[PDB]
Specification:
The complex is a heterotetramer. Chain A is α+β, with helices and mostly antiparallel strands. In chain A, a hairpin with a 4-residue loop joins β3 and β4. In chain A, α1 packs antiparallel against α2. Chain C contains 3 helices and 29 strands. In chain C, the strands form 9 sheets. In chain C, strands 9, 10, 11, 14, 16, 19, 21 and 22 form an 8-stranded mixed sheet that branches. In chain D, β6 and β7 form a beta hairpin. Classes of the chains: A alpha+beta, B mainly beta, C mainly beta, D mainly beta. Chains in contact: A-B, A-C, A-D, B-C, B-D. At the A-C interface, β1, α1, α2 and β4 of A face β1, β28 and β29 of C. β1 of chain A pairs antiparallel with β1 of chain C. The structure holds 2-acetamido-2-deoxy-beta-D-glucopyranose (6 copies). The site of one 2-acetamido-2-deoxy-beta-D-glucopyranose has 5 residues of chain C, from β10. One 2-acetamido-2-deoxy-beta-D-glucopyranose (NAG) binds next to α3 of chain A. Chain D: This is Ig-like domain-containing protein. Chain D: Keywords: Adaptive immunity, Disulfide bond, Immunity, Immunoglobulin, Immunoglobulin domain, Metal-binding, Signal, Zinc. Chain D: One of its GO terms (cellular component) is extracellular region.
């Protein structure tokens, strides 16, 4: 039952948030959600519903102003609706692209934040996990998750383990 | 039927500890963030603590650290607030609450959807007595009568009329703390003056703190 | 033991929703919200808007006063509902610029008719026909006065009706188009009639054309309906040497949020700000797919039946 | 931590009016703000969440338009049912602080109080206590004065009064005034009178009874 990262894997059994940690140490396995990175994405998505409607309400009038100048016959109106329906889909498509970009972006920021914490005491395994080269019990994990891990505390031990083989 | 009912409130002398319990009924209790909120009498709501959807995580308000302890038995569909080292800041009504899903997540910090009726916990080393009930029957277009609930402690008492079928025109006044240390209340209901003993009027007073049962007829 | 592993991951759903992006036409996501209302109850809510069911009558038939539409006299509405089963049962008529008169009256939201005296000297009033019977006897549009010759002369009518009130008056009048030259002379004496109505701001001159049309209710003739608005301080002048279908008075015009809709949906007791021919729809979503014709606070019509807004990160199943 | 500062603390408005409450924060919270309603005697129900979304089965009159450190819950075409206290809650992160509260009260036509007085029952007199109750039913405004008279002797200090919150149906209040005495004080005097100063005919009304008579 080895744990895997975000590279080509998602966590079905993670409902408390969008991003989180999963560990394997001397005291057994565990899991925890990361609220700061999750809450950052949520704050942006809350913004998007209003923005998607504040701008769709801008094109709808813009299009009508152009057709009002032309003035409605049925072939003229259906063209208007086809043009407005195309514009609406494009806006929503663009926001969806942005939502997927900002959610994928938040994952990388969390991975890099963790890498900076571990500094030279761990190595990137390549599947979205770090192999931390020292005894990191449950209390040691929480310090990484809440951003207080001091690598200098474990430098002598960690470097000695990497030297081994 | 999607509800959640509390229990456990009552009297406790300063310095000891209580345990409130929340009982969910009618939904996926196992998949829900649950909160606790209290209110000073006629003041405002105070958010106390939250428990994750599984028990793993727990967070408490600043003025509530140390003393309180949430916990849950998903097999039992139950939640607990376990107040310790009670103080005069604990007299209040304590409510459950369910956290709403946020974009499909069981996030720990969200708004509160469903609420319980609320058990009241009053810290005091005073008496723990049932109520005395007296009828208010006058005689003089519409006329009013009522019931006077006297000398009870602690809060609260509920008052219904005709086993709950008669509610229109009722006014149950807020209790006031008597100089004797017990509360006093009074419940009234307006009816047509022409309904003199052709209609039976019964106020049903229930005082749960002491498991008391009362039915008092008010007649001309 | 001597080392440990700390993995980073994201949440996932067993089966997510498909949305569209700039790079992908269908990319599965953990959450999305629907922005297009596509369902209707099928009934029109009588509240809060005052809905008036036309049933067998159209707005124009009620306006002119078709015998079977007399119940709509002085009737008011917020939305007038016109049924496909509606029919005409009076004198055959046409209305140049029908849409505009229908739209104009619909916006007023009332059929309040005030009768005026109008002195028609030298002509026979209250003409009728067997095509427009009212009761056992023959009749005509209640709001129109069919003038014909008196004896052997149809003089040049030259009547004036000033607007001294503080609102716009809508006058409905017409021009008779006989099917034969004998009919023309027998009714109006002169071989070629003329009807002109004018105001200080407007003028309408029309010379009737004598022509047989397809038989409607046993008649080959028609009437052309016209309308004039007279603003305060203006005056209505009617000059006619023949074929005039005189007005009996005016309709009080109002400017409001009223309109008309063509629908065959039943009306029901419920509340809905938005109304479509297909029935009422909830206005919680920004867009809608039920009908481009709407009334009240409605979502904007879109052709799509679904527009999903990504509300989550991309969903990949765990392996 | 952050600190919500709801306002106004309380207000009175007329039916059909446009009321607005404002929740302010001492630090940005995004859209993580919710609005709660607590009708008298009822448990609080949720109104707005995410700053602007409305909750199912919640009247459409309610809407929320804010973000950052400045939010606004707005009631348009205020109705009688909307009598209650409204709280804003910040759920960005712990602690999920609540506003201080806002009480919304209706402003309507003037109503005169119905006065009744109830002597103590024989069952109560038996136990050595004498409670005289004076009731003011369905009146407006809240401000009112009660005066006790025992055979014309004004007794003050041994009286307690309680007021119901405005009812949704008639937008009225009710007040109870209870005078608690021993067996000795009640049984010594005849006329126990309840004097009300408000607005009958703008003249103080008196309702009296003679002990053990009518
Ligand atoms: C982080 O977690 C550790 C537990 O290992 C705890 O000692 C420390 O106080 C935490 N710091 C913060 C800022 O929460
Ligand atoms: C669970 O509920 C049953 C019935 O109330 C009770 O006997 C038991 O002690 C409860 N305990 C837990 C831990 O759920
Ligand atoms: C998406 O998330 C919202 C958040 O509450 C939830 O109500 C909805 O059911 C979810 N829908 C899907 C398709 O996941
Ligand atoms: C319509 O209203 C006018 C207004 O004065 C009135 O004279 C007329 O009799 C009314 N007609 C009907 C049919 O109610
Ligand atoms: C018709 O009436 C107008 C009223 O101003 C008058 O000027 C005009 O001379 C009249 N026409 C005839 C032919 O008498
Ligand atoms: C809606 O109603 C119109 C009638 O005007 C009908 O032709 C159309 O097929 C209906 N479509 C839907 C989706 O309700």
């Amino acid at each position: 039952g080895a744990i895997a990262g975000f590279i080509e894997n998602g966590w079905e059994g993670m409902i408390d948030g969008w991003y989180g940690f999963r560990h394997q140490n001397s005291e057994g396995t565990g899991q925890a959600a990361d609220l700061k990175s999750t809450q950052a994405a949520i704050d942006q998505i809350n913004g998007k519903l209003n923005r998607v409607i504040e701008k769709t309400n801008e094109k709808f009038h813009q299009i009508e102003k152009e057709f009002s100048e032309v003035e409605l016959e049925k072939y003229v109106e259906d063209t208007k609706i086809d043009l407005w329906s195309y514009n609406a889909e494009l806006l929503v498509a663009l926001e969806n692209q942005h939502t997927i970009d900002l959610t994928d972006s938040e994952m990388n920021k969390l991975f890099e934040k963790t890498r900076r914490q571990l500094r030279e005491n761990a190595e990137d395994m390549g599947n979205g996990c770090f192999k931390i080269y020292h005894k990191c019990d449950n209390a040691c994990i929480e310090s990484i998750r809440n951003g207080t891990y001091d690598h200098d505390v474990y430098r002598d031990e960690a470097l000695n383990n990497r030297f081994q083989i | 039927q999607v509800q959640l009912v509390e229990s456990g409130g009552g009297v406790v002398q300063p310095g000891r500890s209580l345990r409130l319990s929340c009982a969910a009924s009618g939904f996926s209790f196992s998949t829900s963030v649950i909160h606790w909120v209290r209110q000073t009498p006629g003041k405002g709501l105070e958010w106390l603590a939250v428990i994750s959807y599984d028990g793993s995580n727990k967070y408490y308000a600043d003025s509530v650290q140390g003393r309180f302890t949430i916990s849950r038995d998903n097999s039992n569909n139950t939640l607990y607030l376990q107040v310790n080292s009670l103080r005069p800041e604990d007299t209040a009504v304590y409510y459950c609450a369910r956290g709403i899903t946020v974009f499909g997540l069981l996030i720990i910090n969200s708004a509160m959807d469903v609420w319980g009726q609320g058990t009241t916990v009053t810290v005091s080393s005073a008496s723990t007595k049932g109520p005395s009930v007296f009828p208010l029957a006058p005689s003089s277009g519409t006329a009013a009568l009522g019931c006077l609930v006297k000398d009870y402690f602690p809060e609260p008492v509920t008052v219904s009329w005709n086993s709950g079928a008669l509610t229109s025109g009722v006014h149950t006044f807020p209790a006031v703390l008597q100089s004797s240390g017990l509360y006093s209340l009074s419940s009234v209901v307006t009816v047509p003056s022409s309904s003199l003993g052709t209609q039976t009027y019964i106020c049903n007073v229930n005082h749960k703190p002491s498991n008391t049962k009362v039915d008092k007829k008010v007649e001309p | 033991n001597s080392t440990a592993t700390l993995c980073l991951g994201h949440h996932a759903v067993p089966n997510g929703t498909l949305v569209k992006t700039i790079t992908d036409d269908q990319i599965e996501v953990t959450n999305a919200t629907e922005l297009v209302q596509s369902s209707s109850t099928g009934k029109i809510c009588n509240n809060p808007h005052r809905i008036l069911d036309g049933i067998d009558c159209t707005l124009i038939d009620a306006l002119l006063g078709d015998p079977h539409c007399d119940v709509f006299q002085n009737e008011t509405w917020d939305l007038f509902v016109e049924r496909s089963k509606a029919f005409s049962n009076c004198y055959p008529y046409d209305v140049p610029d029908y849409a505009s008169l229908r739209s104009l009256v619909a916006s007023s939201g009332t059929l309040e008719f005030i009768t005026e005296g109008f002195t028609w000297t030298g002509v026979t009033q209250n003409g009728g026909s067997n095509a427009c019977k009212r009761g056992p006897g023959s009749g005509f549009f209640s709001r129109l006065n069919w003038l014909t010759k008196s004896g052997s002369t149809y003089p040049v009518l030259n009547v004036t009706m000033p607007n001294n009130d503080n609102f716009d008056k809508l006058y409905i009048w017409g021009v008779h188009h006989p099917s034969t030259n004998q009919e023309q002379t027998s009714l109006y004496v002169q071989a070629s009639g003329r009807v002109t109505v004018s105001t200080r701001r407007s003028q309408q001159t029309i010379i009737p054309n004598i022509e047989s049309r397809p038989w409607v209710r046993g008649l080959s003739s028609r009437i052309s309906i016209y309308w004039t608005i007279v603003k305060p301080g203006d005056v209505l002048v009617i000059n006619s040497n023949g074929n005039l279908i005189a007005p009996r008075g005016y309709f009080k015009m109002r400017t409001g949020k009223s309109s008309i809709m063509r629908s065959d949906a039943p009306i029901d007791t419920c509340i809905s700000e938005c109304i479509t021919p297909n029935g009422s729809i909830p206005n919680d979503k920004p867009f809608q797919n039920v009908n481009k014709i709407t009334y009240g606070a409605c979502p904007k019509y879109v052709k799509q039946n679904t527009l999903k807004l990504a509300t989550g990160m991309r969903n990949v199943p765990e392996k | 931590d952050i600190q919500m500062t709801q306002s106004p603390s309380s207000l009175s408005a007329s039916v059909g009016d446009r009321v607005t409450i404002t929740c302010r924060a001492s630090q940005g919270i995004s859209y993580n703000l919710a609005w709660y309603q607590q009708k008298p005697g009822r448990v609080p129900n949720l109104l707005i969440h995410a700053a602007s979304r409305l909750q199912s089965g919640a009247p459409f009159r309610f809407s929320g338009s804010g973000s950052g450190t400045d939010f606004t819950l707005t009631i348009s075409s205020l109705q009688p049912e909307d009598v209650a206290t409204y709280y804003c809650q910040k759920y960005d992160s712990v602690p999920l602080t609540f506003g201080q509260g806002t009480k919304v009260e209706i402003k309507r036509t003037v109503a005169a109080p119905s006065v009744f007085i109830f002597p103590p029952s024989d069952e109560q007199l038996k136990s050595g206590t004498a409670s005289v109750v004076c009731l003011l039913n369905n009146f407006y405004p809240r401000e009112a004065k009660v005066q006790w008279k025992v055979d014309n002797a004004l007794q003050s200090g041994n009286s307690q009064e309680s007021v119901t919150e405005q009812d949704s149906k008639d937008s009225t209040y009710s007040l109870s005034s209870t005078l608690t005495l021993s067996k000795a004080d009640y049984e010594k005097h005849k006329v126990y009178a309840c004097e009300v100063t408000h607005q009958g005919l703008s003249s103080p009304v008196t309702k009296s009874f003679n002990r053990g008579e009518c």
